[PDB]
Amino acid sequence: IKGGLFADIASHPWQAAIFAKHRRSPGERFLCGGILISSCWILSAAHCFQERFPPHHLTVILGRTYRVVPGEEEQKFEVEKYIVHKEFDDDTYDNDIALLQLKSDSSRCAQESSVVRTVALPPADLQLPDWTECELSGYGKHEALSPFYSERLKEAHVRLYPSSRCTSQHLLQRTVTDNMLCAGDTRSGGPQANLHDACQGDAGGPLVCLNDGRMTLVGIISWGLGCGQKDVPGVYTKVTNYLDWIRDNMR
């Protein structure tokens, strides 16, 4: 998360961390953000899994403020299985969405608390007013060049760019589809100018906006020409285009 400020997981209780076990060494390294939408499921980005780990390599961590300190009330899961979208494009990042099912015994995996809770999926008839402000969360880098990822969860605030401003014209010649969604910081740039944006390691995390007074998942962090540039928005997966899919991939 470029710009914004550090956070508490309790302010973003659907944020999850995804870890992948190393390949020579013992132990996991931080991979991606994730979003708890049902007790036993989490959304994330497809491209997090381009390197197709078997599930057992993956661990999900709900309810944790620091990316590497265990949280006291956190909830840690072995992945049972994961479903990358069949038509995820690994070059345009079209259809960038995945589904991780949490491995548990009892059809009841994570459970609600002051730090772990599911975020509402948007209604299909959702069209939000342009430049609506939304938030986002991540353990990712603070700036594109930072050696390390965040030591702690951050939050950010951005505004949904209108369609006309989400073509590749405004993204340095890069394919943008009806499945993608750009939000960004529409304040004046400097520098200094700490424009709120997500960064390396935030992909898979949520972009949550108010609607009906109800925090509702609108996008999934995906790509950008990051992080935090010259009125160059951050691109997201339009979650509404995938409501049937999501349904149809929980059976």
């Binding site: 390294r29 931080f30 991979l31 991606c32 980005a45 491209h47 997090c48 381009q50 390197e51 990042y93 990712g140 594109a144 060049l145 990822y149 340095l172 010649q173 997500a198 960064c199 390396q200 390691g201 935030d202 992909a203 898979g204 962090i221 995906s222 790509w223 950008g224 020409l225 990051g226 992080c227």
Partner: protein
């Protein structure tokens, strides 16, 4: 066919490698072999049979000359954006009596000629030579210190030079180039500039027979025609000349075989290397003693009038790694793009590299990067 020449030239590289301690070497295994094969025609009896031994073929045998020609053909170059530049040149005395029917036969195989200068008048044997190179290497190589040793009794002298610059299939954004602590072999540490890019790269992990692991990694040049292969050891105490002296043309092919295309954050140091080599010892290490000896050198196929020996033989190479030519972010290239956290791959240890002509597997360049 072309693996033979490359592998020979690798052997040539090994010899210099072991002599050059922990120092920056760069070298052309093609370059060396493309002139030795030439000089092969111009030799006799055991002097020849010496260099054919080392190389493993007779340029004289069928199809063998055509091959090299046709290789050279490709290198220059409709796709080669003034990126490479070769030259191979042998010089001899102006007024001399060469055998009848040779210098034409020689043109026939190589299509070049053997260059005739006046060594007696030394001042502009030197120029002439340093400006043969100058012309054919697009000025990127001009001087050549080793020509100092040219005197008037100096009568037969051999030169090879190449200047290579990148032009990546996927260039690094200039924006993202930062200074970074490289660690040298001894222990020390230098703040070198290192370009970074988070893309998808062909990688594989290789181990030598002796439990030494390296990260092998392929960074292709535009159209995938040339690739550079970087090869750096896991932990820093591992000697390069552990790999370097089992390096081979079908070793490289072995790497591309095991490669899978994986998303990684690559961090890699810019560098610019220029090595001039005196080939005598290296070539003599391989058992090529006759050519440099006044009494024993057999050059009768071109000679007739005697003696005639190689006083001097040299290679001057220059490779440049950055992102192609001033170009820089079009902006096409950019630092992160898609926002997952990926496995880093950092190159802060000394390593080595190879540049390749993927269609033919011909090994064009080589080197140890001990320090930028």
């Amino acid at each position: 066919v072309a693996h033979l020449a490359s592998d020979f030239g690798v052997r040539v590289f090994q010899q210099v490698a072991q002599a050059s301690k922990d120092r920056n070497v760069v070298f052309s295994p093609y370059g060396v072999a493309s002139v030795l094969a030439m000089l092969q025609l111009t030799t006799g009896g055991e002097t020849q049979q010496q260099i054919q031994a080392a190389m493993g073929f007779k340029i004289d045998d069928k199809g063998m000359a055509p091959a090299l020609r046709h290789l050279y053909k490709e290198l220059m170059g409709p796709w080669n954006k003034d990126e490479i530049s070769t030259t191979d040149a042998i010089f001899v005395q102006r007024d001399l009596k060469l055998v009848q029917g040779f210098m034409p036969h020689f043109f026939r195989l190589f299509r070049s000629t053997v260059k005739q200068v006046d060594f007696s008048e030394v001042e502009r044997a030197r120029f002439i030579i340093n400006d043969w190179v100058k012309t054919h290497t697009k000025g990127m190589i001009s001087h050549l210190l080793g020509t100092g040793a040219v005197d008037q009794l100096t009568r037969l002298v051999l030169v090879n030079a190449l200047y290579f610059n990148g032009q990546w299939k996927t260039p690094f954004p200039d924006s993202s180039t930062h200074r970074r602590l490289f660690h040298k072999s001894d222990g020390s540490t230098v703040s070198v500039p290192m370009m970074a890019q988070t893309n998808k790269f062909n990688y594989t992990e290789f181990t030598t027979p002796d439990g030494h692991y390296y990260d092998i990694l392929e960074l292709p040049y535009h159209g995938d025609t040339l690739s550079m292969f970087i090869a750096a050891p896991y932990e820093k105490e591992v000697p390069l000349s552990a790999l370097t002296n089992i390096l081979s043309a079908q070793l490289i092919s072995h790497w591309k075989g095991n490669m899978t295309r994986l998303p990684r954050l690559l961090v890699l140091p810019k560098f610019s290397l220029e090595t001039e080599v005196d080939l005598r010892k290296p070539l003599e290490n391989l058992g090529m003693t006759d050519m440099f000896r006044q009494f024993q050198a057999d050059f009768t196929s071109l000679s007739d009038q005697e003696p005639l020996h190689v006083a001097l033989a040299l290679q001057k190479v220059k490779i440049e790694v950055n992102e192609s030519g001033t170009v820089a972010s079009s902006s096409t290239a950019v630092i992160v793009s898609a926002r997952m956290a990926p496995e880093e791959i950092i190159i802060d240890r000394p390593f080595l590299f190879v540049v390749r002509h993927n269609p033919t597997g011909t090994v064009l360049f080589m080197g140890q990067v001990m320090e930028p």
